[PDB]
Design a protein around this ligand. Sequence first.
Ligand SMILES: [Zn+2]
Ligand SMILES: [Zn+2]
Ligand SMILES: [Zn+2]
Ligand SMILES: [Zn+2]
Lengths: 290, 290, 290, 290
Amino acid sequence: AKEILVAYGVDIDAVAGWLGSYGGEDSPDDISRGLFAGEVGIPRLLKLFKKYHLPATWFVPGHSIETFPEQMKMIVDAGHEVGAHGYSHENPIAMSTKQEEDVLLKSVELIKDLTGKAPTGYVAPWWEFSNITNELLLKHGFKYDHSLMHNDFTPYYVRVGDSWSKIDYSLEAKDWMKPLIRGVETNLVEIPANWYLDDLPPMMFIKKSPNSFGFVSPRDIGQMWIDQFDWVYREMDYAVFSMTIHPDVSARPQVLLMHEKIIEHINKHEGVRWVTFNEIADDFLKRNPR
Amino acid sequence: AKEILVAYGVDIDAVAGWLGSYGGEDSPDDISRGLFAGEVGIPRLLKLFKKYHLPATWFVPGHSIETFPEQMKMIVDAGHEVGAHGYSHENPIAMSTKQEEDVLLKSVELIKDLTGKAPTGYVAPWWEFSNITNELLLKHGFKYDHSLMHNDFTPYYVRVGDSWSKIDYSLEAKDWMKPLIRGVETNLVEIPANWYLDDLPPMMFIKKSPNSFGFVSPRDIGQMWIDQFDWVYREMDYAVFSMTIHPDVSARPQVLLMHEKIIEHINKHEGVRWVTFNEIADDFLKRNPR
Amino acid sequence: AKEILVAYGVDIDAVAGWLGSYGGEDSPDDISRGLFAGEVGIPRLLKLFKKYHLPATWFVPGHSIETFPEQMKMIVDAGHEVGAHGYSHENPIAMSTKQEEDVLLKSVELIKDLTGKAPTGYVAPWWEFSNITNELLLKHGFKYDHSLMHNDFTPYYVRVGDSWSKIDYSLEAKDWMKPLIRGVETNLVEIPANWYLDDLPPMMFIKKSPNSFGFVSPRDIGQMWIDQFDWVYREMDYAVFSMTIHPDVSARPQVLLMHEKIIEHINKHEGVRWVTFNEIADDFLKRNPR
Amino acid sequence: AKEILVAYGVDIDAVAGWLGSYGGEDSPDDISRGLFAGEVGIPRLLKLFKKYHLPATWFVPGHSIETFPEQMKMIVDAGHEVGAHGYSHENPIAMSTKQEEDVLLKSVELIKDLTGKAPTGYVAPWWEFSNITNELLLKHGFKYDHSLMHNDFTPYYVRVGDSWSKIDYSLEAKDWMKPLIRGVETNLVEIPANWYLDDLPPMMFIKKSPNSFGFVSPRDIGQMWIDQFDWVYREMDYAVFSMTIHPDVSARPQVLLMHEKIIEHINKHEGVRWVTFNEIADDFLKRNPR
Ligand SMILES: [Zn+2]
Ligand SMILES: [Zn+2]
Ligand SMILES: [Zn+2]
Ligand SMILES: [Zn+2]
């Protein structure tokens, strides 16, 4: 028996992505791409999904919620899930605890006002943590996170309190020669992030980044994503296969075609189930409690 | 039912590009590559266009006009359109108001003395704005710009006055948790620039930039460009599909071949119309006014 | 006659590589990747190796030995070799001679404890030497190293005492215009490292490095690795063909697929012997003494 | 009819390149790649050329001469041409006038003692000039340089005295809004360098460079080189098609294979003539004097 849970996760980075993460704060041109992502990118992603009758989870920065209100209505009315993703896409590790907690509070408030329900899902901007577990569980709603990478194609419960010894070369070796020390499992389910199922780093060009790419072939990317799916399909009976995309990138014509090949390849397989992240979190919590 | 407007926008970066944008000001070797683009590159692209009976718009830095006067004659005499592109490829955002204005004055004077008419088209060097909209409309002529990215395959009127709140981590979150505020549309038409339709960053090698590439395959890029065309053709009845190239890069034999594949593919389609950017601007001004 | 010795060398970088080399010491997201590599990665490479009945050598950081004890047990039970690889993946050049010596002792202590025998093989973290060659022979055990690049498909005896003159542009040219002066062979066998046979740089994404890649296609790399083998099989009668992998990278489904191709292709060839690094070293020491 | 002059230019960077250009001066591991290039790389490229009965020019750093004397004898006895390439691959633009002149005097001295005749050919390390034109013509011998890029597939006489105005944003625009002023042709013939016909930047990995690559596919590079040859052959009656390689890179098995494909493709075409750079230079001097 094959139970393959498959989801698209859309991080609406848009203008917020350029303020917090990708260095576009003083660039009109970069800001204009942020606006493309919302005004042009969200609806093309909705048409793509509507075409294959797919559900999806949208992780939306508070900035994008208030900057693209008309497209936000289009997202809710399609019956899709809205999750959290900062306000202006700020990297949590760079914020104070109060700044991070305030950002999360505003996000919940903005999503609740938009959907009627509190968000249950989170993606940390640029995928970085801090004391986020404690904050997510504390700020109610939050059932699951899609930011961490302890695993691949299986959800798990996130541990709080892991520690490790950093190398300090001004000391002697015995001071840092100690093994990572595992913390304690919490109720936050992880639906793992994955750089190999992330449209943005290979296919978006960023001048302000030393590790920007942007000109990797979408056919090579699609093919790689598809090889990942085939392997998962061949090796695992239950699995979650989630793809992280951004209207910024995946609503560009060349990678829209890529997604059509991916979806159409996945749909050739029996035992596939297109779902939202909340449904994965619900199913996993029911699959193995504790 | 198909009206696909298709154009080459040739930015004659040549030497100007290396003085203003690409860090070659102290490199005899980079400077000589600049001379290749003017002396060798302009005639090879002209031969390319003549072969397929294509029109084109050349956006020429004042530096290139005065450094390659004989190649300039070849561009005019072929009946192609000439637009502005700085003098020494200066990034507008680093310039003063007067410097940027002076640059713009000189560009206009030079193109007028060369062609007989004032330019109607502008490309910002390295695609960066500042307060350019206002200057383009003030310095007469300028009908259209090809620097911005609010859209990809549909022109639009450029808004002046968009504002946004930068993240300041020395303050509290509420100080930057505000949306982008849209300004007001001017009569400046935008014929969108697109990093995904720009020969230079993937296929020009630059020692002085850490986000240089240069060795992305021209067959992949061409295939990507054609995929962009095919999606546009399948989804839209009216569209403008403009390609930004440089003699620097697109006059290298391996990408001259690439363009031949592209042009021959585009030419298989009904409803294609090869045009200048000015013709797109005029056609757009007539299509939807205000 | 053909004797083609083929081997997999697994550097279990994991959490250690992020601590020592890849900038992830202040990143919960990167540490999470580290733990993937050890908890999921290690058993998937074992399933692969066992699928083709292959031996392997695992060059294991002390930090990984102690952080992943259940996976260590699994490595020894399968009968694979365990070589040394620092503790927290520290660069031998950044360390005091005492730190370095203390790192090598603790490694040796940990591996003996685990296996019953002292290690005979070493890989230097991030592939650098310093005064290692003396320390490796001195710390008894060590027969062979797999860090250096004087050759590629033939082992050789590591020379000690090589020196060269650096360019100081403050002085005159005659002060630095001198050749490299070769030292003297030692008994340390080199089983050469090779950037062209290393899964990590092309295919792990790292933001903390400007020299990072991550999105080079695994199909392109697999092809390039087979091409290397294809030339070798055709041009040499005796050869060693070792591939450096990491559970970090080679336990990702798309790279596992890559390896399956590489392995099956290599098994079409007769004269091929799948061995451990210790067996290559032993072979070499028999092949040509002194 | 068809006279396509085709040559390999082998720059023996080896250890010199790591001292002078690629940041390996403090790296035992990089130095070993340097030694690989000389000890293993030169003979493999000699076996390659001999197989197809090809002549070649080796542009050899004095550092490589004195460090690989036995391989230097192999290059001479194979009857190939020897040109200059710095001592420790030093960038001319970084050197004093005296250092650069001293470096050049020593190179001439070493090459003469090695071959019997003074060198006629020069490649600037890392391809940069300064006041080299004057020194190459002053330091007798030197007939041709292969460092500059004013053209790609036609030789030319190098101009001395080119000048241009740099951008200084502390002044007004009119201060720098002036064209490049061409100087005057000298007798130095250029057989152009070309980043698109250079094996090293796409396929050698350099940790010290932010602009390093190293993992671009050799099949893509080979295909790109064959596309260049195919266009030149289709478009030109007389042309020089010279390829720059390094034992460092092109003596790697995956790239030897690439070259075999390249050479075999070129040999199918009529009018091809494999020559040394010296023969190209002489042919050019005879083709058009002045
Ligand atoms: Zn995001
Ligand atoms: Zn430009
Ligand atoms: Zn390692
Ligand atoms: Zn060189």
